[PDB]
Amino acid sequence: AALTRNPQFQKLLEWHRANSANLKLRELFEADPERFNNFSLNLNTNHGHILVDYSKNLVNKEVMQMLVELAKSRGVEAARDNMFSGSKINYTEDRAVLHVALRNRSNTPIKVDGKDVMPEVNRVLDKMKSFCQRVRSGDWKGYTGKSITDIINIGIGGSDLGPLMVTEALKPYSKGGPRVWFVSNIDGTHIAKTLASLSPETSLFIIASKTFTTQETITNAETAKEWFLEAAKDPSAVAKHFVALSTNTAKVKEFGIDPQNMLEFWDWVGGRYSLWSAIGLSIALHVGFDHFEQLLSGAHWMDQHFLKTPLEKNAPVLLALLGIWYINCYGCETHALLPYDQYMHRFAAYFQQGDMESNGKYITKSGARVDHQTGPIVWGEPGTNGQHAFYQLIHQGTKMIPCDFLIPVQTQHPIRKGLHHKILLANFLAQTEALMKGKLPEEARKELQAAGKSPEDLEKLLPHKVFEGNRPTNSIVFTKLTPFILGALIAMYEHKIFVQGIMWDINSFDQWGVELGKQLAKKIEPELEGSSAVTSHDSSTNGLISFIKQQRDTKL
Amino acid sequence: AALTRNPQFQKLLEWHRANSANLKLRELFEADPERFNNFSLNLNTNHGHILVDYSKNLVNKEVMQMLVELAKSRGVEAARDNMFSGSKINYTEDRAVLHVALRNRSNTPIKVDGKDVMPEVNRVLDKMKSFCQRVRSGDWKGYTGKSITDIINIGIGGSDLGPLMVTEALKPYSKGGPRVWFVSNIDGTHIAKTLASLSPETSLFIIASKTFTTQETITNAETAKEWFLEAAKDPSAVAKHFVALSTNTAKVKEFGIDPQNMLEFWDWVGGRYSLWSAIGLSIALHVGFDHFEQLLSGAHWMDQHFLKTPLEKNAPVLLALLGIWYINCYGCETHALLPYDQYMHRFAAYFQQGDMESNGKYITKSGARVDHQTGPIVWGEPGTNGQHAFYQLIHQGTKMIPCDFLIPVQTQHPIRKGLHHKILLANFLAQTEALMKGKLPEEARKELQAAGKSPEDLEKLLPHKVFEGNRPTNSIVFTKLTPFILGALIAMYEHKIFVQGIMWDINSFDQWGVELGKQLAKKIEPELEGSSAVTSHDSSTNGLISFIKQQRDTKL
Ligand SMILES: O=C[C@H](O)[C@H](O)COP(=O)(O)O
Ligand SMILES: O=C[C@H](O)[C@H](O)COP(=O)(O)O
């Protein structure tokens, strides 16, 4: 594998092995009054600042230098440039990787197969803008001549989680706009309980599918269409209530949606990077196209920062490099995303997909099997709730867990003269301080003495009260969570994932395990029909099928 | 540490060293046609069956024997009995651990300090039942004399996650119940967006807090009261709209709530084991007291299973042991919970707390630091969505991830003559089969041949399309997700967590690891007030505060 053969990597690993045990966050801060100043990036976007404070990490000057050298040696800059210029860097599928084109506000040419993609990107955006105005204004009427009150996105994975996470995060920008619903699971519960709350007269369905063949999405869409036509009784009416977002015109038409009711995107838009495209229509409908444009613009700002900034002060590069340090040198399996923001409640889940589906890989560009770790398990929940759920383990367990803490300085709801947000901010700050500093036995001993504990009780309790600390974090703080800033933040992590992928020499942009998934259920579906015993498979699969057949009729 | 000095553990470790490299799931099944039969438990509860299929695990007869022996030689049977008898096994806080008393439907006496706890458990349940009758009938009137339409639980962590997860899971059972809302984050967004949708005349607030001092909860509660008083004006009208669930009568009265409107619980009820107590009030209000009793009865059934069953066929014990095997022998940091059920969408998050806050520990009963792993990072999202996202990494990444796949045989919504559920089931079955089997080069090559790939294109793409498999799973299948069955499932994992805690020699029932964060936040809170620079901390904390002070009055 390319990474482990790399001399800069070997140097880094050897340094870690010899020196890492001597790195203590508490001592790093004591020894260097300028630590924050030298290990943070204050980015001015001209529409808010984003401070990336990486000073609470197990790094020093030489470590960062070695990490930056590794990024150079692994050709991060050239690979980045190739992505941006429309090179077919998704080599297993022979595709360009051009989510950056979707938000290319500068409109500079980006060519695929000799042709600039910008005119088609902008044409679709213009179409989205027109449609949103017609729907949000109440001009667009349902089959009984009523304005639309509910938008329902039907899609899964990349055709679901982006629009869901972003509409949740930008909820305060949705005043006046129609309600938005997300149906994704094949589990009939999802569509059933959604439809139960809706009228066919005032619901507009958005069928979101790159391929337009995904089993969950097409089945859900057919169920919705059946429900709709049971009420409307007019195939002509489907045009008023169904829109497709896809690359597959033939399958859209096959389903029963006319191409004029289709907004297209392209093969170089990966699902987990698709919210910027036509797939973002439910966002634009919910918050307005203006705010959707601001979202695109923030991503564009961050794209430019990524493209033009020297590696040593490049925000997504530094986040990627810190990740490499913890993954390939320390061996940390996971990375936690902990936004101190209720609107961001699905942010961690979004990048759980974006990161893991991208970098959960084991074959390189050369076809080699990796002999090192690739992508981490990404997880998290919003603060402060996590403090009362799993922070016990972060503080006092046996796992090293790099954490990104994120918060906006300004809240969307400054209730009680800002009291709630002051408390929220205090916790955000305290938790990373606590993770860094810990509490020494002698410090814990003094507290227990002042608590009036007898010598016997104190000695039994003491070790349980000790916090070993030295637990590293990033703190990412931004002026306010506006559409623009959110766009910038999502793009930042997209580029983090890119840099890690290039360094590991893997393809961040295919998903053969997801493709495998879509082939699997067809072989079992037919066996579930009828009362016949299944002996076809391994005994577990067989035994589970037998249990299912036995139990499906019993009346509880 | 007790575990590492245990000779049965050393034997297990050495077996793993010698034999685990050649342990292959495919081969285990091919060699043993009785595998499913001898590595699964079909539990008949008399109210549905629960099948715990652990056959797709990297274990054989000898491994399971060694694991059972380890449980025995670590004192699991005696420790369990001590829990059930009211022994003060929460040794750092000197408390009993008696969530099993809460759901003790048999009413067998359980003594703490010589007194049976059951009379008081039952008195509170009777009062809970009375509250439910009054609210659900419409007999409970708000300050203008109108029936309650909305219930709002205010609480965090143990006082939030349980009621939230269970009301979500049992949503079909909520016909005729009030709408239920959960406010938990201190983030003002949470209460603000909730209160915007409510009328003070028809809203009942439930302040859920064991201590009745938690900052987030008491602050949210006071904000709710302030909002109410703006409308109702009369401080005596508060008494019709506020109910408390707590152990602290004194603090409840101080807040202004009459004991008439209080439901009590006890110190031996851990927050993360509290949904079975008064804390479950919002569940019982939403789905009715009879369904809440069924939930308790299901847990009770599982309690009896755990108490009476020989270890080698004891469901929570076997789940615990498989976890010990993967954590302490294979070194797997994480454990994924993957319910193929939309109603169970908060199940993984619930046990993220239940597991991680219990077993994220590093000090043993002796006071020694563990020199082995304890609790795993728990995570997951419902199927089938995960198949389109992080399953990419489960299938093709560099991490070993034990997964529990869960599904009901019967769906709550058998739409399209069961079509959706058939597809869901087929995916559930096919994914664990594929995780075990993978896809061989000879299988992948035929697909590339059929696609018309050139010998050279085929050769380059081939390794990307091969799946190594050998990824172990549990399949947990149950007749239907009824209140009873849900109760049994939750209790099962509660007892799994208990067993692992005993084996690690840790206290599953305290949570000292949250203290430091709370201490440091109280110091920072007042520092945020005013324009003056803060220098009392490390430079990162100081610098973040400076950025917050600079950015909070920036107008975007
Ligand atoms: O990579 C995940 C995909 O986004 C998901 O399978 C949906 O695919 P689709 O957009 O083609 O329906
Ligand atoms: O373990 C977490 C606790 O349940 C949480 O902090 C809430 O505590 P409380 O019920 O005392 O408010």
PDB file of C-alpha atoms in Angstrom, chain A residues 29 33 36 42 49 51 53 55-56 92 156 184-189 191 214-216 220 223 226 331 333-334 341-343 346 352-353 356-357 360-364 369-370 372-377 379 381 383-385 387-390 392-393 395-396 398-399 401 409-410 413 415-416 420 422-423 426 429-431 433-434 436 438-439 447 463-468 477 479 511-514 516-517 519-521 525 528-529 537-541 543-545 547-548 551-552 554 556, chain B residues 29 36 42 49 51 53 55-56 92 156-157 184-189 191 215-216 220 223 226 331 333-334 341-343 346 352-353 356-357 360-363 367 370 372-377 379 381 383-385 387-390 392-393 396 398-399 401 409-410 413 415-416 420 422-423 426-427 429-431 433-434 436 439 447 461 463-464 466-468 477 479 511-517 519-521 524-525 528-529 537-541 543-545 547-548 551-552 554 556:
ATOM      1  CA  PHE A  29      -0.308  24.282  27.643  1.00  0.00           C
ATOM      2  CA  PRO A  33       1.576  30.503  26.557  1.00  0.00           C
ATOM      3  CA  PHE A  36      -3.831  28.659  21.220  1.00  0.00           C
ATOM      4  CA  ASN A  42      -9.493  32.156  12.541  1.00  0.00           C
ATOM      5  CA  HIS A  49     -15.913  33.913  11.172  1.00  0.00           C
ATOM      6  CA  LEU A  51     -12.457  29.542  14.331  1.00  0.00           C
ATOM      7  CA  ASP A  53      -9.083  25.619  17.376  1.00  0.00           C
ATOM      8  CA  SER A  55      -4.729  23.394  20.107  1.00  0.00           C
ATOM      9  CA  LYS A  56      -6.216  20.751  22.453  1.00  0.00           C
ATOM     10  CA  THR A  92     -13.379   2.504 -10.476  1.00  0.00           C
ATOM     11  CA  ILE A 156     -32.716   6.961   0.834  1.00  0.00           C
ATOM     12  CA  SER A 184     -36.742   6.832   3.337  1.00  0.00           C
ATOM     13  CA  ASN A 185     -37.012   3.431   4.991  1.00  0.00           C
ATOM     14  CA  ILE A 186     -38.698   0.610   3.092  1.00  0.00           C
ATOM     15  CA  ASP A 187     -40.250  -0.237   6.478  1.00  0.00           C
ATOM     16  CA  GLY A 188     -43.936   0.502   5.756  1.00  0.00           C
ATOM     17  CA  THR A 189     -44.186   2.391   9.025  1.00  0.00           C
ATOM     18  CA  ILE A 191     -44.622   6.056   4.528  1.00  0.00           C
ATOM     19  CA  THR A 214     -33.355   1.852  -5.733  1.00  0.00           C
ATOM     20  CA  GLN A 215     -35.779  -0.641  -4.212  1.00  0.00           C
ATOM     21  CA  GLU A 216     -36.809   1.360  -1.122  1.00  0.00           C
ATOM     22  CA  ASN A 220     -42.192   4.025  -1.499  1.00  0.00           C
ATOM     23  CA  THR A 223     -47.089   3.358  -2.632  1.00  0.00           C
ATOM     24  CA  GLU A 226     -51.216   4.491  -5.411  1.00  0.00           C
ATOM     25  CA  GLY A 331      -5.163   3.533  16.383  1.00  0.00           C
ATOM     26  CA  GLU A 333     -11.342   3.508  15.738  1.00  0.00           C
ATOM     27  CA  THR A 334     -13.793   6.379  16.129  1.00  0.00           C
ATOM     28  CA  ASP A 341     -26.819  22.983  18.709  1.00  0.00           C
ATOM     29  CA  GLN A 342     -30.250  21.357  18.683  1.00  0.00           C
ATOM     30  CA  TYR A 343     -30.912  22.406  15.077  1.00  0.00           C
ATOM     31  CA  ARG A 346     -28.687  15.264  12.485  1.00  0.00           C
ATOM     32  CA  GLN A 352     -21.514   9.328   9.661  1.00  0.00           C
ATOM     33  CA  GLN A 353     -22.636   8.588   6.088  1.00  0.00           C
ATOM     34  CA  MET A 356     -17.883   6.185   6.412  1.00  0.00           C
ATOM     35  CA  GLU A 357     -19.406   5.566   2.952  1.00  0.00           C
ATOM     36  CA  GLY A 360     -14.689   2.723   4.571  1.00  0.00           C
ATOM     37  CA  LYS A 361     -12.454   1.053   1.964  1.00  0.00           C
ATOM     38  CA  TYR A 362      -9.651  -1.512   1.837  1.00  0.00           C
ATOM     39  CA  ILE A 363      -8.348  -1.431  -1.781  1.00  0.00           C
ATOM     40  CA  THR A 364      -6.031   1.281  -3.168  1.00  0.00           C
ATOM     41  CA  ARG A 369      -5.066  -4.400  -0.079  1.00  0.00           C
ATOM     42  CA  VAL A 370      -4.367  -1.811   2.624  1.00  0.00           C
ATOM     43  CA  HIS A 372      -3.202   0.106   7.639  1.00  0.00           C
ATOM     44  CA  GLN A 373      -6.435   1.593   8.971  1.00  0.00           C
ATOM     45  CA  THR A 374      -8.706   3.680   6.743  1.00  0.00           C
ATOM     46  CA  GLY A 375     -11.913   5.514   7.658  1.00  0.00           C
ATOM     47  CA  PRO A 376     -13.094   5.767  11.284  1.00  0.00           C
ATOM     48  CA  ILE A 377     -16.530   5.029  12.738  1.00  0.00           C
ATOM     49  CA  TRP A 379     -20.799   9.088  15.598  1.00  0.00           C
ATOM     50  CA  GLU A 381     -25.263  13.488  19.479  1.00  0.00           C
ATOM     51  CA  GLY A 383     -24.540  18.881  23.404  1.00  0.00           C
ATOM     52  CA  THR A 384     -25.437  19.222  26.120  1.00  0.00           C
ATOM     53  CA  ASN A 385     -27.462  15.966  25.969  1.00  0.00           C
ATOM     54  CA  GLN A 387     -22.895  14.931  28.585  1.00  0.00           C
ATOM     55  CA  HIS A 388     -25.741  13.018  30.242  1.00  0.00           C
ATOM     56  CA  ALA A 389     -25.526   9.995  27.911  1.00  0.00           C
ATOM     57  CA  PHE A 390     -22.024   8.891  26.916  1.00  0.00           C
ATOM     58  CA  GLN A 392     -18.994   9.260  31.141  1.00  0.00           C
ATOM     59  CA  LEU A 393     -17.102   6.946  28.778  1.00  0.00           C
ATOM     60  CA  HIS A 395     -13.968  11.001  30.391  1.00  0.00           C
ATOM     61  CA  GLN A 396     -13.403   7.767  32.321  1.00  0.00           C
ATOM     62  CA  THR A 398     -10.687   2.932  28.226  1.00  0.00           C
ATOM     63  CA  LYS A 399     -11.062   4.446  24.735  1.00  0.00           C
ATOM     64  CA  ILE A 401     -11.917   9.272  21.104  1.00  0.00           C
ATOM     65  CA  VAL A 409     -21.624  32.137  19.038  1.00  0.00           C
ATOM     66  CA  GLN A 410     -25.027  33.678  18.248  1.00  0.00           C
ATOM     67  CA  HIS A 413     -33.401  31.950  19.921  1.00  0.00           C
ATOM     68  CA  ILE A 415     -34.550  33.656  25.036  1.00  0.00           C
ATOM     69  CA  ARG A 416     -34.323  34.798  28.691  1.00  0.00           C
ATOM     70  CA  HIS A 420     -29.846  29.472  27.864  1.00  0.00           C
ATOM     71  CA  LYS A 422     -24.700  31.455  27.988  1.00  0.00           C
ATOM     72  CA  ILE A 423     -25.142  28.117  29.797  1.00  0.00           C
ATOM     73  CA  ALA A 426     -20.203  27.490  29.253  1.00  0.00           C
ATOM     74  CA  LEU A 429     -16.005  25.352  26.799  1.00  0.00           C
ATOM     75  CA  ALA A 430     -15.897  23.405  30.073  1.00  0.00           C
ATOM     76  CA  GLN A 431     -16.120  19.963  28.497  1.00  0.00           C
ATOM     77  CA  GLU A 433     -11.170  21.967  29.176  1.00  0.00           C
ATOM     78  CA  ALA A 434     -12.116  19.001  31.403  1.00  0.00           C
ATOM     79  CA  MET A 436      -7.750  18.172  28.386  1.00  0.00           C
ATOM     80  CA  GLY A 438      -8.507  16.043  33.979  1.00  0.00           C
ATOM     81  CA  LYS A 439      -8.259  15.954  37.776  1.00  0.00           C
ATOM     82  CA  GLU A 447     -12.123  18.150  47.264  1.00  0.00           C
ATOM     83  CA  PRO A 463      -9.650   6.565  42.563  1.00  0.00           C
ATOM     84  CA  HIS A 464     -13.233   6.783  41.187  1.00  0.00           C
ATOM     85  CA  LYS A 465     -13.044  10.588  41.362  1.00  0.00           C
ATOM     86  CA  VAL A 466      -9.802  10.823  39.375  1.00  0.00           C
ATOM     87  CA  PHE A 467      -9.907  12.068  35.778  1.00  0.00           C
ATOM     88  CA  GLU A 468      -6.809  11.095  33.797  1.00  0.00           C
ATOM     89  CA  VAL A 477     -16.772  28.001  16.723  1.00  0.00           C
ATOM     90  CA  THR A 479     -20.445  33.531  14.382  1.00  0.00           C
ATOM     91  CA  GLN A 511     -19.386   2.563  -2.767  1.00  0.00           C
ATOM     92  CA  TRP A 512     -19.180  -1.071  -3.879  1.00  0.00           C
ATOM     93  CA  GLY A 513     -20.529  -2.264  -0.503  1.00  0.00           C
ATOM     94  CA  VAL A 514     -23.623  -0.105  -1.008  1.00  0.00           C
ATOM     95  CA  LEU A 516     -23.610  -5.027  -3.161  1.00  0.00           C
ATOM     96  CA  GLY A 517     -26.457  -4.231  -0.742  1.00  0.00           C
ATOM     97  CA  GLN A 519     -28.356  -6.923  -5.126  1.00  0.00           C
ATOM     98  CA  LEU A 520     -28.884  -8.992  -1.966  1.00  0.00           C
ATOM     99  CA  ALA A 521     -32.576  -9.007  -1.027  1.00  0.00           C
ATOM    100  CA  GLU A 525     -37.762 -12.206  -1.157  1.00  0.00           C
ATOM    101  CA  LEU A 528     -40.539 -15.585   2.185  1.00  0.00           C
ATOM    102  CA  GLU A 529     -43.625 -16.245   0.036  1.00  0.00           C
ATOM    103  CA  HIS A 537     -28.932 -21.217   2.759  1.00  0.00           C
ATOM    104  CA  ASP A 538     -26.645 -21.553   5.792  1.00  0.00           C
ATOM    105  CA  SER A 539     -28.541 -22.913   8.842  1.00  0.00           C
ATOM    106  CA  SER A 540     -28.839 -19.454  10.447  1.00  0.00           C
ATOM    107  CA  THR A 541     -30.493 -17.832   7.440  1.00  0.00           C
ATOM    108  CA  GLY A 543     -33.542 -20.925  10.848  1.00  0.00           C
ATOM    109  CA  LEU A 544     -34.446 -17.241  10.802  1.00  0.00           C
ATOM    110  CA  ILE A 545     -36.690 -17.753   7.760  1.00  0.00           C
ATOM    111  CA  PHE A 547     -38.967 -18.541  12.636  1.00  0.00           C
ATOM    112  CA  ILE A 548     -40.437 -15.769  10.460  1.00  0.00           C
ATOM    113  CA  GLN A 551     -44.483 -16.496  13.797  1.00  0.00           C
ATOM    114  CA  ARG A 552     -46.126 -14.349  11.103  1.00  0.00           C
ATOM    115  CA  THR A 554     -49.880 -15.836  15.540  1.00  0.00           C
ATOM    116  CA  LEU A 556     -50.861 -11.447  20.075  1.00  0.00           C
TER     117      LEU A 556
ATOM    118  CA  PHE B  29     -21.415 -23.455   9.361  1.00  0.00           C
ATOM    119  CA  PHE B  36     -28.209 -22.571  14.240  1.00  0.00           C
ATOM    120  CA  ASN B  42     -35.959 -19.349  21.026  1.00  0.00           C
ATOM    121  CA  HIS B  49     -41.363 -15.322  20.936  1.00  0.00           C
ATOM    122  CA  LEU B  51     -35.285 -15.545  18.962  1.00  0.00           C
ATOM    123  CA  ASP B  53     -29.634 -16.073  17.023  1.00  0.00           C
ATOM    124  CA  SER B  55     -24.761 -18.423  15.383  1.00  0.00           C
ATOM    125  CA  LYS B  56     -23.136 -15.944  12.978  1.00  0.00           C
ATOM    126  CA  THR B  92     -19.251   3.888  45.503  1.00  0.00           C
ATOM    127  CA  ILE B 156     -32.249  15.315  30.271  1.00  0.00           C
ATOM    128  CA  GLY B 157     -30.315  12.047  29.958  1.00  0.00           C
ATOM    129  CA  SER B 184     -34.078  18.318  27.149  1.00  0.00           C
ATOM    130  CA  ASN B 185     -31.237  20.433  25.759  1.00  0.00           C
ATOM    131  CA  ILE B 186     -30.369  23.658  27.602  1.00  0.00           C
ATOM    132  CA  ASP B 187     -30.011  25.083  24.072  1.00  0.00           C
ATOM    133  CA  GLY B 188     -32.856  27.625  24.061  1.00  0.00           C
ATOM    134  CA  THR B 189     -33.856  26.398  20.604  1.00  0.00           C
ATOM    135  CA  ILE B 191     -37.860  24.915  24.581  1.00  0.00           C
ATOM    136  CA  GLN B 215     -29.123  22.903  35.514  1.00  0.00           C
ATOM    137  CA  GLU B 216     -30.608  22.200  32.069  1.00  0.00           C
ATOM    138  CA  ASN B 220     -35.989  24.833  31.101  1.00  0.00           C
ATOM    139  CA  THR B 223     -38.507  29.192  31.321  1.00  0.00           C
ATOM    140  CA  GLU B 226     -42.238  32.184  32.918  1.00  0.00           C
ATOM    141  CA  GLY B 331     -10.182  -5.514  20.676  1.00  0.00           C
ATOM    142  CA  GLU B 333     -13.981  -0.588  20.214  1.00  0.00           C
ATOM    143  CA  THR B 334     -17.608  -0.490  19.122  1.00  0.00           C
ATOM    144  CA  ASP B 341     -37.808  -0.834  12.537  1.00  0.00           C
ATOM    145  CA  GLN B 342     -38.595   2.849  12.082  1.00  0.00           C
ATOM    146  CA  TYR B 343     -40.446   3.045  15.420  1.00  0.00           C
ATOM    147  CA  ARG B 346     -34.110   6.033  19.074  1.00  0.00           C
ATOM    148  CA  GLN B 352     -25.706   4.559  23.930  1.00  0.00           C
ATOM    149  CA  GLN B 353     -26.468   5.944  27.409  1.00  0.00           C
ATOM    150  CA  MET B 356     -21.715   3.724  27.839  1.00  0.00           C
ATOM    151  CA  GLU B 357     -22.653   5.587  31.013  1.00  0.00           C
ATOM    152  CA  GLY B 360     -17.434   3.509  30.505  1.00  0.00           C
ATOM    153  CA  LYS B 361     -15.354   2.993  33.640  1.00  0.00           C
ATOM    154  CA  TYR B 362     -11.721   2.351  34.564  1.00  0.00           C
ATOM    155  CA  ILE B 363     -11.596   1.753  38.354  1.00  0.00           C
ATOM    156  CA  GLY B 367      -9.752   0.491  43.591  1.00  0.00           C
ATOM    157  CA  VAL B 370      -8.263  -1.702  34.811  1.00  0.00           C
ATOM    158  CA  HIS B 372      -8.028  -4.081  29.941  1.00  0.00           C
ATOM    159  CA  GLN B 373     -10.875  -2.632  27.872  1.00  0.00           C
ATOM    160  CA  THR B 374     -14.281  -1.968  29.405  1.00  0.00           C
ATOM    161  CA  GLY B 375     -17.461  -0.670  27.759  1.00  0.00           C
ATOM    162  CA  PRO B 376     -17.700  -0.223  23.985  1.00  0.00           C
ATOM    163  CA  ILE B 377     -18.803   2.775  21.958  1.00  0.00           C
ATOM    164  CA  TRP B 379     -23.943   3.407  17.887  1.00  0.00           C
ATOM    165  CA  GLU B 381     -29.264   3.803  12.834  1.00  0.00           C
ATOM    166  CA  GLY B 383     -32.191  -0.519   8.671  1.00  0.00           C
ATOM    167  CA  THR B 384     -32.524  -0.382   5.817  1.00  0.00           C
ATOM    168  CA  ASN B 385     -31.067   3.146   5.771  1.00  0.00           C
ATOM    169  CA  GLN B 387     -27.228  -0.193   4.049  1.00  0.00           C
ATOM    170  CA  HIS B 388     -26.898   2.953   1.928  1.00  0.00           C
ATOM    171  CA  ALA B 389     -24.354   4.596   4.212  1.00  0.00           C
ATOM    172  CA  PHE B 390     -22.097   3.222   6.951  1.00  0.00           C
ATOM    173  CA  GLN B 392     -20.085   0.429   3.214  1.00  0.00           C
ATOM    174  CA  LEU B 393     -17.508   0.526   6.022  1.00  0.00           C
ATOM    175  CA  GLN B 396     -15.349  -3.104   3.161  1.00  0.00           C
ATOM    176  CA  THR B 398     -10.654  -2.024   8.180  1.00  0.00           C
ATOM    177  CA  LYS B 399     -12.670  -2.339  11.395  1.00  0.00           C
ATOM    178  CA  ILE B 401     -17.743  -4.243  14.215  1.00  0.00           C
ATOM    179  CA  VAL B 409     -41.851 -10.558  12.344  1.00  0.00           C
ATOM    180  CA  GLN B 410     -45.188  -8.721  12.323  1.00  0.00           C
ATOM    181  CA  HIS B 413     -48.468  -1.283   9.303  1.00  0.00           C
ATOM    182  CA  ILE B 415     -49.524  -1.880   3.883  1.00  0.00           C
ATOM    183  CA  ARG B 416     -49.762  -3.214   0.288  1.00  0.00           C
ATOM    184  CA  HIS B 420     -42.981  -3.344   2.451  1.00  0.00           C
ATOM    185  CA  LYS B 422     -41.493  -8.628   3.087  1.00  0.00           C
ATOM    186  CA  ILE B 423     -38.808  -6.413   1.537  1.00  0.00           C
ATOM    187  CA  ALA B 426     -35.520  -9.971   3.116  1.00  0.00           C
ATOM    188  CA  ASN B 427     -32.984  -7.152   3.570  1.00  0.00           C
ATOM    189  CA  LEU B 429     -31.808 -11.623   6.390  1.00  0.00           C
ATOM    190  CA  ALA B 430     -29.658 -10.951   3.319  1.00  0.00           C
ATOM    191  CA  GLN B 431     -27.373  -8.421   5.020  1.00  0.00           C
ATOM    192  CA  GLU B 433     -25.823 -13.543   5.306  1.00  0.00           C
ATOM    193  CA  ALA B 434     -23.618 -11.294   3.144  1.00  0.00           C
ATOM    194  CA  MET B 436     -20.844 -13.614   6.908  1.00  0.00           C
ATOM    195  CA  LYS B 439     -18.390 -12.238  -2.268  1.00  0.00           C
ATOM    196  CA  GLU B 447     -20.538 -10.172 -12.964  1.00  0.00           C
ATOM    197  CA  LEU B 461     -11.915  -3.432 -11.084  1.00  0.00           C
ATOM    198  CA  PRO B 463     -10.443  -6.460  -6.143  1.00  0.00           C
ATOM    199  CA  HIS B 464     -12.773  -3.470  -5.539  1.00  0.00           C
ATOM    200  CA  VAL B 466     -14.665  -8.593  -3.711  1.00  0.00           C
ATOM    201  CA  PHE B 467     -15.905  -8.795  -0.109  1.00  0.00           C
ATOM    202  CA  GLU B 468     -13.905 -10.688   2.491  1.00  0.00           C
ATOM    203  CA  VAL B 477     -36.148 -11.547  15.910  1.00  0.00           C
ATOM    204  CA  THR B 479     -43.074 -11.846  17.034  1.00  0.00           C
ATOM    205  CA  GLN B 511     -21.347   8.014  37.042  1.00  0.00           C
ATOM    206  CA  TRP B 512     -18.531  10.031  38.601  1.00  0.00           C
ATOM    207  CA  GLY B 513     -17.253  10.907  35.127  1.00  0.00           C
ATOM    208  CA  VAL B 514     -19.782  13.698  34.620  1.00  0.00           C
ATOM    209  CA  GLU B 515     -18.711  15.746  37.669  1.00  0.00           C
ATOM    210  CA  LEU B 516     -15.651  17.588  36.302  1.00  0.00           C
ATOM    211  CA  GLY B 517     -17.519  19.010  33.295  1.00  0.00           C
ATOM    212  CA  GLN B 519     -17.688  21.978  37.920  1.00  0.00           C
ATOM    213  CA  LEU B 520     -15.764  23.715  35.138  1.00  0.00           C
ATOM    214  CA  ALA B 521     -18.980  25.014  33.500  1.00  0.00           C
ATOM    215  CA  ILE B 524     -17.068  29.694  33.140  1.00  0.00           C
ATOM    216  CA  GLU B 525     -20.752  30.750  33.169  1.00  0.00           C
ATOM    217  CA  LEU B 528     -18.901  35.012  29.844  1.00  0.00           C
ATOM    218  CA  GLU B 529     -20.722  38.116  31.149  1.00  0.00           C
ATOM    219  CA  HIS B 537      -7.791  29.094  32.139  1.00  0.00           C
ATOM    220  CA  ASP B 538      -5.479  27.480  29.593  1.00  0.00           C
ATOM    221  CA  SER B 539      -4.892  29.535  26.436  1.00  0.00           C
ATOM    222  CA  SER B 540      -7.383  27.551  24.304  1.00  0.00           C
ATOM    223  CA  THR B 541     -10.263  28.072  26.756  1.00  0.00           C
ATOM    224  CA  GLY B 543      -8.969  32.168  23.381  1.00  0.00           C
ATOM    225  CA  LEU B 544     -12.339  30.563  22.671  1.00  0.00           C
ATOM    226  CA  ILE B 545     -13.950  32.890  25.244  1.00  0.00           C
ATOM    227  CA  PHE B 547     -13.654  34.784  20.145  1.00  0.00           C
ATOM    228  CA  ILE B 548     -17.126  34.401  21.707  1.00  0.00           C
ATOM    229  CA  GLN B 551     -18.270  37.652  17.769  1.00  0.00           C
ATOM    230  CA  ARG B 552     -21.491  37.879  19.786  1.00  0.00           C
ATOM    231  CA  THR B 554     -21.415  41.044  15.020  1.00  0.00           C
ATOM    232  CA  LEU B 556     -24.888  39.458   9.813  1.00  0.00           C
TER     233      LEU B 556
END
